[PDB]
Amino acid sequence: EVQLVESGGGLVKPGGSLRLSCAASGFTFSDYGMNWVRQAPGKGLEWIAYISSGRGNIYYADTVKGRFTISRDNAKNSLYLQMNSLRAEDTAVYYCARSWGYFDVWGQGTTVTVSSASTKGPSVFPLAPSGTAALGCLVKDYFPEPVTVSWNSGALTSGVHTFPAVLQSSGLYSLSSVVTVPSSSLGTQTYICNVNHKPSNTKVDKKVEP
Amino acid sequence: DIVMTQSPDSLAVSLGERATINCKSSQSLLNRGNQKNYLTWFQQKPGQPPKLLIYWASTRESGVPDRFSGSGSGTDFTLTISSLQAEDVAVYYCQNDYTYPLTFGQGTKLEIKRTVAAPSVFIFPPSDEQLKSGTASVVCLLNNFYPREAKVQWKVDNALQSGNSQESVTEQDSKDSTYSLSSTLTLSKADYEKHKVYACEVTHQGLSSPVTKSFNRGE
């Protein structure tokens, strides 16, 4: 089976550097042109770098030329992106993509955040319920993105709404996750939101009681 | 650059009906040496890489249902999605594959058009745990409404609030094609404890007049 897997993304300060990697399997890597394509939060796709198979022709988007360099190691079925002189506008999910006149294989992406702000884990607060009731968890003041939220370790999915994170004026993110339930379920069920903030290695389970 | 321009920027189409997304290039995409128009269409859902739908302007990728169809030539291209299904809600992109730099259209958001549905509204006071730390977040939840347009206003002791709230909206629900929305009012703890009535006022096409949910601090 054909697979592409990016790694190396993380938080880095403006002016800093970072190397991304992409490992490939399930096809003859050396026979294909390979690419990096990125997507800033809430924006469209932007192709940024290419390296061909035989001649290794190299093309860059002007936005990264002179700062980013693409390379490949066919013995390791690997593609690299060396990113120097990073700017806030380089914040994005970075995808590895195979091409044959069009991008036909994509990785899941690796996320790069360029900011001077420090990593901070969230505080988790209950949204307590008052024939429909609502309850939830407020996940406040974290950096950088992302946080993930599940309910009852993934067993509760129906009626859940986990909202997109919002950037506060403080430069920290916040989001809420809610669920609607029949009001009679409040006495027969336990509600626990499981919050994970990997950039800070924070894991919290908060029980939500009326 | 070859500049790629999609039309419309967003589109709402009823289940089972036909969706049409247009893409115009600022220059020809026709390869004179193999006669292919190097125009490519992608579908992208949140949290996922884009999925290849059509390449060479009209060739369907393997596994793509035949209800997806690409057409056009020169500088004018069209993606058609017949018999729209809920799984087709996504952002669609066209892309120049002809010459570098490879350029994308700005994307077109396709949603399901369904009947009007008024929200259920809920209000949450801040937790005692949060209050202790110096901050008060008041949350107003709008549940399972359509269309997305809604006005949510905060009133504190009956005075309209400005500048101290932020909203977030979910993607269309897979089962009923509705949206949900949260509005969060943020005050300091000292400020929060100076007021009594906290109200969220919701205006929406599904509601005959605005709906208010409120609580009295300490009650």
Across B97-150, the runs of DSSP E, i.e. the strands, are 103-104, 108-113, 120-124, 135-145
Task: Copy the structure tokens of residue B69.
Answer: 């169809």
- Residue B103: its chain A contacts at CB < 8 A? 47
For the domain spanning B1-113, the CATH number is: 2.60.40.10
Check if the beta carbon of residue B98 is closer than 8 Å to that of residue B31. yes
Mutate to test the interface with B, among A3, A57, A64, A125 (most CBs of B within 10 A): A125
Interface of B with A in 116-155 (CB under 8 A): 120, 122, 124, 126-127, 129-130, 133, 135, 137, 139, 141, 143
- Residue A38: its chain B contacts at CB < 8 A? none
Element (H, E) at B132: helix B128-132
Residue B9 is given by DSSP the state S
Task: Copy the structure tokens of residue B212.
Answer: 């208010």
Q: Parallel, antiparallel, or unpaired for β A110-114 and A11-12?
A: parallel
Amino acid at residue number A157: T
Exposed / middle / buried, residue B52 (Cβ in 10 Å: 0-12, 13-18, 19+): buried
Structural domains of chain A in order of their starting residue, each with its CATH number: 1-116 (no CATH), 117-210 (2.60.40.10)
- For the CA atoms of A13, A9, A152, A42, what is the dihedral angle to 10 degrees? 80
Q: B185-211: string of b/e by CB count within 10 Å (b at 16+)?
A: bbbeeeebeeeeebbbbbebeeeeeeb
**DSSP class per residue in B12-37:** EEETTS-EEEEEEESS--B-TTT--B
d(CA A18, CA A86): 8
d(CA A152, CA A146): 20
Give the Å distances, CA to CA, from B115 to A96, B84, B119, B146, B178.
40, 16, 13, 7, 10
d(CA A204, CA A121): 10
Contact (CB<8Å) B180/A161: yes
- Residue A97: its chain B contacts at CB < 8 A? 49
- 3-class secondary structure, A131: coil
CA atoms within 13 A on the CB side of B187: 20
Interface of B with A in 11-30 (CB under 8 A): none
Greatest CA span in chain B, whole angstroms? 77
Check if the beta carbon of residue A85 is closer than 8 Å to that of residue A15. yes
**DSSP class per residue in A58-118:** EEE-TTTTTTEEEEEEGGGTEEEEEE-S--GGG-EEEEEEEESSSEEEE---EEEEE-SSP
d(CA A108, CA A164): 19
d(CA A93, CA A109): 6
Element (H, E) at B128: helix B128-132
Cβ contacts of B62 within 8 Å, gap of 6 or more: none
Cβ contacts of B194 within 8 Å, gap of 6 or more: none
Closest CA to A16 of A99, A70, A88: A88
- Residue A176: its chain B contacts at CB < 8 A? 139, 168, 182, 184
Contact (CB<8Å) A102/B40: yes
Please identify which residue in the block is written with the tokens 């890597």. Answer: A29
Closest CA to A122 of A145, A101, A88: A145
As annotated, the residues of chain B forming the CATH 2.60.40.10 domain(s) are 1-113, 114-219
Distance from the B127 Cα atom to the nearest Cα atom in chain A, whole angstroms:
6
Long-range contacts of A38-42 (CB under 8 A, 24+ apart): A38/A90, A38/A92, A38/A93, A38/A94, A38/A95, A39/A92, A39/A93, A39/A95, A39/A109, A40/A89, A40/A91, A40/A92, A41/A91, A41/A92, A41/A145
Mutate to test the interface with B, among A161, A170, A193 (most CBs of B within 10 A): A161
d(CA A128, CA A42): 31
Closest CA to A107 of A32, A5, A2: A5
- Residue B100: its chain A contacts at CB < 8 A? 50, 59
Please identify which residue in the block is written with the tokens 């992406």. Answer: A109
> Which class would CATH give B114-219?
mainly beta
Stated in angstroms to one decimal place, the resolution of this structure is 1.7
3-state helix, strand, coil in chain A (%, to 5): 10, 55, 40
Q: Omega into B147 within 30° of 0, i.e. cis?
A: yes
B4: Cα separation from own chain's centroid: 21
Cβ contacts of B218 within 8 Å, gap of 6 or more: none
Contact (CB<8Å) A47/B102: yes
Give the Å distances, CA to CA, from B189 to B109, B137, B178.
40, 9, 35
Check if the beta carbon of residue A103 is closer than 8 Å to that of residue A127. no
Contact (CB<8Å) A123/B133: yes
Task: Copy the structure tokens of residue B70.
Answer: 């690409």
Contact (CB<8Å) A50/B100: yes
Please identify which residue in the block is written with the tokens 């993934």. Answer: A154
Q: Is B77 an interface residue toward A (CB < 8 Å)?
A: no
Cβ contacts of B116 within 8 Å, gap of 6 or more: B146, B147, B205, B206
Exposed / middle / buried, residue A121 (Cβ in 10 Å: 0-12, 13-18, 19+): middle
Give the Å distances, CA to CA, from A186 to A27, A180, B141, B193, B213.
52, 11, 18, 29, 21
Cβ contacts of B129 within 8 Å, gap of 6 or more: A125, A126
Give the residues across from B53 on adjacent strands. Answer: none
Element (H, E) at B191: helix B189-192
Task: Copy the structure tokens of residue A120.
Answer: 């901070």
Closest CA to B73 of B108, B98, B39: B39
Contact (CB<8Å) B102/A95: no
Task: Identify the experimental approach.
Answer: X-ray
Strands of A18-25's sheet in order across: A3-7, A18-25, A78-83, A68-73
